[PDB]
Write a protein that binds this ligand. Structure first.
Ligand SMILES: NCCc1c[nH]c2ccc(O)cc12
Length: 387
């Protein structure tokens, strides 16, 4: 009963460590191998997000029809396959294929783990608060990602970070012996309202846009910042990956402090501050001309993204309880689609803008748009009811 929480937390951890061990390796590796590369790196990064966004409805169908453990085992297999593909392949196409597979793997793991965790814990009084461990699986994975993918990549080469990640994925899959079997036909029943009907509501879009933009900021920063750092003569030792470390250590505290303080000031008055602080603190990024000049803006970016996560995650459900037939899956689907839309559109537009007009202007434009988006949170003061 307890071990499912740890298993889903670890399966999110080993997915979102994989998601961010790529950012220091593949950009620099493709920069080196060719000695305008953004036109390819951006799409190589956006493939995972577009694949997960496409795949989510079908895995939802699979979970509704024939149960949760099957997609969990599928995701467990796909994560190891993608990791072993990263550890060995060199050509661009066979990195793109693995990043494509990682999208289906992330979809399976996230959706099925959320569903089965909700099923085991059932009622709100426990499950609703326990759900916040998803963010704790997010934060530590993102924290160990860049340092582990950079330091050992400097010390013992390309294959080491993915090799040691696979050494953990195999252990996690062996611990999953208790549930998953070669042959399992499993039951499930119908609940809730589908996303395609929920997003038809224009009011929920106002809340989804905040988290979408707050993640799109970092999703555009991710493909380009290593290239920008390489252009300004940065190294790998304590330099190439550690630049992302303050953002992670700040995210750890952002998901906790204002998560505790939410109700004390109004969650919309915290979402507004998170949005504005993201917009302001990504403007300071282009103007830093030294590695130690990037510590200050990242310590704000991570904190502000955590402040938006821990102040929008309950809200997407608080409204859905007031307007539509609600279930845990319908609550999580909004957040997952809002995450994936940003993580897909960000790199796709970045790989064009940063190459046609430049990276600092891309960050400035995103910051200004994020700042100007803030007044839209005025509407969440109180939503009116409906039939
Ligand atoms: N896809 C960007 C991953 C990433 C790198 N550094 C980060 C810092 C905080 C965060 O939430 C996420 C990240």
């Amino acid at each position: 009963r307890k071990l499912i929480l740890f298993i889903v937390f670890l399966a999110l951890l080993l997915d979102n460590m994989l998601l961010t061990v790529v950012v220091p390796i593949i950009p620099s590796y493709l920069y080196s191998i060719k000695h305008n590369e953004n036109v390819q790196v951006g799409l190589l990064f956006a493939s995972k997000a577009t694949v997960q966004l496409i795949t989510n409805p079908f895995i939802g169908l699979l979970t509704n029809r024939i149960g949760y453990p099957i997609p969990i085992f599928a995701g467990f297999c796909i994560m190891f396959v993608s990791t072993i593909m990263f550890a060995f392949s060199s050509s661009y196409a066979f990195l793109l294929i693995a990043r494509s597979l990682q999208g289906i793997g992330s979809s399976c793991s996230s959706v099925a783990g959320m569903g089965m965790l909700a099923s085991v814990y059932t009622d709100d009084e426990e499950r609703g608060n326990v759900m916040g461990i998803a963010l704790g699986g997010l934060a530590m994975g993102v924290l160990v990602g860049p340092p582990f993918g950079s330091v050992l990549y400097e010390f013992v080469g390309k294959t080491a970070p993915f090799l040691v990640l696979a050494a953990l994925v195999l252990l996690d899959g062996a611990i999953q012996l208790f549930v998953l079997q070669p042959s399992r036909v499993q039951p499930e029943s119908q609940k809730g309202t589908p996303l395609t009907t929920l997003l038809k509501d224009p009011y929920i879009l106002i809340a989804a846009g905040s988290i979408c933009f707050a993640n799109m900021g970092i999703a555009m920063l991710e493909p380009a910042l290593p290239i920008w750092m390489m252009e300004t003569m940065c190294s790998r030792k304590w330099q190439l990956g550690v630049a992302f470390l303050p953002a992670s250590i700040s995210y750890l505290i952002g998901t906790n402090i204002f998560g505790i303080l939410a109700h004390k000031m109004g969650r919309w008055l915290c979402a507004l501050l998170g949005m504005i602080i993201v917009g302001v603190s990504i403007l300071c990024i282009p103007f830093a001309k030294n590695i130690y000049g990037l510590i200050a803006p990242n310590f704000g970016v991570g904190f502000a993204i955590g402040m938006v996560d821990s102040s929008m995650m309950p809200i997407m459900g608080y409204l859905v309880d007031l307007r539509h037939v609600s279930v845990s899956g319908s609550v999580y689907a909004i957040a997952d689609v809002a995450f994936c839309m940003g993580y897909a559109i960000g790199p796709s537009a970045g790989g064009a803008i940063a190459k046609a007009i430049g990276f600092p202007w891309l960050m400035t434009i995103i910051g200004i748009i994020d700042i100007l988006f803030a007044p839209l949170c005025f509407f969440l003061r109180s939503p009116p009811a409906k039939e």
